[PDB]
Amino acid sequence: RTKSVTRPTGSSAVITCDLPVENAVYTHWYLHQEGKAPQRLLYYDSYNSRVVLESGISREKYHTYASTGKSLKFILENLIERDSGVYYCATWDYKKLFGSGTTLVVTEDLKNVFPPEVAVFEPSEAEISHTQKATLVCLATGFYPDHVELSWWVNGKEVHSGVCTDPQPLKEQPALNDSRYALSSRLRVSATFWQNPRNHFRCQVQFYGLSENDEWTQDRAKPVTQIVSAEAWGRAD
Amino acid sequence: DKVTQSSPDQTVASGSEVVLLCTYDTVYSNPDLFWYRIRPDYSFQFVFYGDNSRSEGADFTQGRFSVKHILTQKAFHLVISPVRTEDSATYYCATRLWLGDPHTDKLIFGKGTRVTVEPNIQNPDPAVYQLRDSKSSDKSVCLFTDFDSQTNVSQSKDSDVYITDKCVLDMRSMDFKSNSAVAWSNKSDFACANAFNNSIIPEDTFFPSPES
Amino acid sequence: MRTHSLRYFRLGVSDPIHGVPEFISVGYVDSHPITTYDSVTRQKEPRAPWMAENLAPDHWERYTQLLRGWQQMFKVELKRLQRHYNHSGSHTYQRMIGCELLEDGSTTGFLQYAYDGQDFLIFNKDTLSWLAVDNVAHTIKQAWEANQHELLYQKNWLEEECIAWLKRFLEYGKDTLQRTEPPLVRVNRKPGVTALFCKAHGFYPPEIYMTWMKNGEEIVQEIDYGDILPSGDGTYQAWASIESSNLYSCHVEHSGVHMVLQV
Amino acid sequence: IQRTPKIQVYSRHPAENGKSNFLNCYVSGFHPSDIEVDLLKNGERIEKVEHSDLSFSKDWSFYLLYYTEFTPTEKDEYACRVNHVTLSQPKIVKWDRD
Numbered sequence: 001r002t003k004s005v006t007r008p009t010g011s012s013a014v015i016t017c018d019l020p021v022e023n024a025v026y027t028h029w030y031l032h033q034e035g036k037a038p039q040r041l042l043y044y045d046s047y048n049s050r051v052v053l054e055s056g057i058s059r060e061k062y063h064t065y066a067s068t069g070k071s072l073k074f075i076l077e078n079l080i081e082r083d084s085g086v087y088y089c090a091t092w093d094y095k096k097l098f099g100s101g102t103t104l105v106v107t108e109d110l111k112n113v114f115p116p117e118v119a120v121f122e123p124s125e126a127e128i129s130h131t132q133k134a135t136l137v138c139l140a141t142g143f144y145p146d147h148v149e150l151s152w153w154v155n156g157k158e159v160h161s162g163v164c165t166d167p168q169p170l171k172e173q174p175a176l177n178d179s180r181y182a183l184s185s186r187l188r189v190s191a192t193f194w195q196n197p198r199n200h201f202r203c204q205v206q207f208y209g210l211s212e213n214d215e216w217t218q219d220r221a222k223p224v225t226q227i228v229s230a231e232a233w234g235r236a237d
Numbered sequence: 238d239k240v241t242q243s244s245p246d247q248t249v250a251s252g253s254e255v256v257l258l259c260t261y262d263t264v265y266s267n268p269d270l271f272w273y274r275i276r277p278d279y280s281f282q283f284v285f286y287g288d289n290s291r292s293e294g295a296d297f298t299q300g301r302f303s304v305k306h307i308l309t310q311k312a313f314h315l316v317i318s319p320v321r322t323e324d325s326a327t328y329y330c331a332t333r334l335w336l337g338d339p340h341t342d343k344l345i346f347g348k349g350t351r352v353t354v355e356p357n358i359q360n361p362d363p364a365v366y367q368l369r370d371s372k373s374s375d376k377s378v379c380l381f382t383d384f385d386s387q388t389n390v391s392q393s394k395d396s397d398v399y400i401t402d403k404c405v406l407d408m409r410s411m412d413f414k415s416n417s418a419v420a421w422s423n424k425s426d427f428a429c430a431n432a433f434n435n436s437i438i439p440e441d442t443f444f445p446s447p448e449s
Numbered sequence: 450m451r452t453h454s455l456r457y458f459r460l461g462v463s464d465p466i467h468g469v470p471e472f473i474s475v476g477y478v479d480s481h482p483i484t485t486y487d488s489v490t491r492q493k494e495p496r497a498p499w500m501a502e503n504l505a506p507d508h509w510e511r512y513t514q515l516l517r518g519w520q521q522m523f524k525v526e527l528k529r530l531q532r533h534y535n536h537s538g539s540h541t542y543q544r545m546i547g548c549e550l551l552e553d554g555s556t557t558g559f560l561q562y563a564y565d566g567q568d569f570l571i572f573n574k575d576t577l578s579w580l581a582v583d584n585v586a587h588t589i590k591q592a593w594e595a596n597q598h599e600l601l602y603q604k605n606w607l608e609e610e611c612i613a614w615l616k617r618f619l620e621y622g623k624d625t626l627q628r629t630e631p632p633l634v635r636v637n638r639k640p641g642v643t644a645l646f647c648k649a650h651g652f653y654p655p656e657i658y659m660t661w662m663k664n665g666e667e668i669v670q671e672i673d674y675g676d677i678l679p680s681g682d683g684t685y686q687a688w689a690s691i692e693s694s695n696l697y698s699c700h701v702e703h704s705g706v707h708m709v710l711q712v
Numbered sequence: 713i714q715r716t717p718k719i720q721v722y723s724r725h726p727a728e729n730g731k732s733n734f735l736n737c738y739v740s741g742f743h744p745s746d747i748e749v750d751l752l753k754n755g756e757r758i759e760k761v762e763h764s765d766l767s768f769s770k771d772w773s774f775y776l777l778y779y780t781e782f783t784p785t786e787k788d789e790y791a792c793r794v795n796h797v798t799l800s801q802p803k804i805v806k807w808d809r810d
């Protein structure tokens with residue numbers, strides 16, 4: 001439910017509010033970062049039609065789209081790596097109702113961005129013989145921006161039961177300042193269900209990269225926002 | 238006004254009681270205090286609200302959440318008596334600053350206390366299988382699973398092999414949850430038997446033979 | 450803790466005297482005037498120095514517009530009531546809305562409409578209903594209960610926003626509202642058999658306990674009582690009498706302190 | 713149904729003769745909110761009267777305070793004169809020095 005955006009340093013970013021109601025009289029905007037407490041960045045007053053900011057932020061940093069009838073948008077300028085985080089809209093109905101929010105990552109250099117490779121590993125026969133349960137492993141490797149979203153689809157349907165995804169990626173080169181990432185996920189089902197050859201399993205990684213607005217000048221492909229995938233079918237042995 | 242969460246990050250069991258410590262200093266005589274949480278899916282949800290004289294909780298608490306608000310010590314603690322694995326999250330406490338109009342008010346949060354609810358494996362079956370790779374990739378995958386939460390995963394001995402950490406897999410259909418950890422490498426001398434040699438392994442860990 | 454209250458009152462009169470305006474609306478925090486709007490000024494104005502100090506200028510304009518709208522609604526409602534009741538001449542319509550934070554921890558919320566000084570409709574926020582007192586009142590009861598979104602909004606304001614308004618008001622007026630001034634207690638002698646007077650003076654919180662005890666035992670009533678009236682300085686006063694060759698002692702409780710004089 | 717107001721005349725401080733103080737008249741509990749209130753010095757109206765604004769009660773009633781600064785002398789008589797619609801004639805209540 002949370003949108004995601006990756007941007008270069010010094011460029012602008014747009015974030016749309018995901019709230020039950022589109023247009024509220026006062027709409028607040030908060031930032032959350034991993035190490036520190038969330039803080040209110042600003043809020044928008046519809047009556048005065050202006051943003052009320054905090055004393056620690058420049059006035060030429062953020063602004064609003066505020067499309068009528070639609071959810072409001074917040075635009076950020078001259079992005080720096082310390083602007084990476086997650087941004088939540090907020091409103092006062094019962095308590096401070098936070099929106100779904102949007103995750104944002106920004107990079108100084110656009111040269112070191114890569115999309116991930118997705119591989120699917122089939123369950124071991126030993127685990128089927130021992131526990132009567134089958135575990136399928138998805139490995140995604142070689143993505144520098146840790147802004148991926150992994151999911152599993154059986155018979156083309158998103159599954160939330162029996163799925164585990166690692167919460168922190170790991171670096172191939174721990175001694176590198178700018179190192180690439182790898183992530184793993186597991187889906188466990190009854191061995192009878194896996195042994196059915198009709199059942200189709202797919203691991204899908206939504207990778208958040210660049211847009212068509214951005215330009216690319218490399219010999220390589222363009223790491224645009226995309227969906228990488230891998231799949232397998234049941235084996236009855 | 239300042240809000241501090243002195244409690245460090247804690248790992249509890251699926252049946253313990255969890256206490257989260259939050260202390261506030263404000264000029265207000267009857268401040269509005271709040272407990273919120275951020276889930277791993279980054280969902281920002283309201284848990285509890287407490288003033289000096291009353292409290293109101295979220296619908297999802299179902300009596301499992303309560304608040305210890307003691308005025309003399311200026312303390313606003315959060316207690317989860319039946320703590321489940323579904324509540325593993327980073328919890329924050331906040332206060333409301335009156336700034337003109339009620340809908341213009343700001344919330345000031347604490348740095349955050351993180352709660353990890355490990356599961357209770359009734360019948361541990363620690364096993365290290367070798368999942369055969371799809372011909373799309375050459376890497377070999379070793380899976381360590383069905384171990385108890387007390388066993389702690391240690392990182393790889395060398396950078397040649399990559400080992401993730403503990404993860405919780407819940408089968409809702411069978412109501413059974415297990416623990417899992419993956420380890421992969423492309424080295425020619427890579428074996429699942431020697432994969433987790435850097436971690437404290439249970440003496441009764443299954444080591445299936447490759448010739449199965 | 451102390452018992453605080455926020456209230457808002459609206460009053461309208463048909464064919465008023467030339468001096469009397471048609472519509473008036475004023476707010477009270479713990480019986481202290483806070484705001485004022487009337488049909489003559491047509492502008493909302495403060496009645497406390499600390500009010501305008503903390504509020505933004507947009508607030509007064511916005512609530513002035515909303516008060517003009519509320520004025521029109523009040524006029525049409527009073528005209529409808531007189532039409533239904535077949536009442537000519539001059540009559541009155543009143544509305545009260547607010548909340549209270551009690552010392553025992555409980556909180557309330559009320560919204561009542563009255564006609565000619567008698568209660569007409571009372572909003573029950575927990576049942577989200579409108580208890581009426583007449584068939585004429587029952588008609589508008591059904592009409593208003595048809596709209597449920599408005600009832601949800603009223604309950605939300607009475608339960609979650611009136612309290613915040615009151616708390617920020619008490620923090621703005623902390624000097625005037627959260628202050629406490631101790632009372633001055635005196636004994637007077639003078640009545641064929643003259644009584645003994647216990648008198649309290651110059652206390653801001655108007656909540657007091659006044660009792661008499663004989664040698665450690667409280668009197669079995671027999672204590673006459675007088676009204677507690679406010680002095681012109683912003684404080685209050687009260688008195689109590691009871692009555693021989695018998696010893697008595699006055700006892701007074703105020704703002705959490707218990708005082709004994711031991712005559 | 714209408715109710716008559718309640719008249720209460722007193723002093724801000726314990727009235728000592730020949731000492732400047734304030735005389736208060738407190739009129740509360742009247743449904744018709746059109747009244748005329750005056751202070752009487754030796755049977756004659758006082759003109760330097762001061763008063764707070766009209767207020768509301770939770771029982772659909774009103775209360776008001778009319779106060780002035782004076783110096784009490786035993787020769788002088790102080791009274792409160794009030795006219796209401798429920799009263800056929802304006803009633804006068806005198807002040808007791810007790």
Ligand SMILES: *[C@@H](C)/C=N/c1c(NC[C@H](O)[C@H](O)[C@H](O)CO)[nH]c(=O)[nH]c1=O
Nearest residue numbers: 457458459474475476484486512546606
């Ligand atoms: C300025 C704050 C004056 N307000 C005012 C109000 N205000 C808010 C109240 O919630 C409102 O009456 C109800 O929501 C209406 O249903 N009320 C009032 O009666 N008089 C005032 O002057």
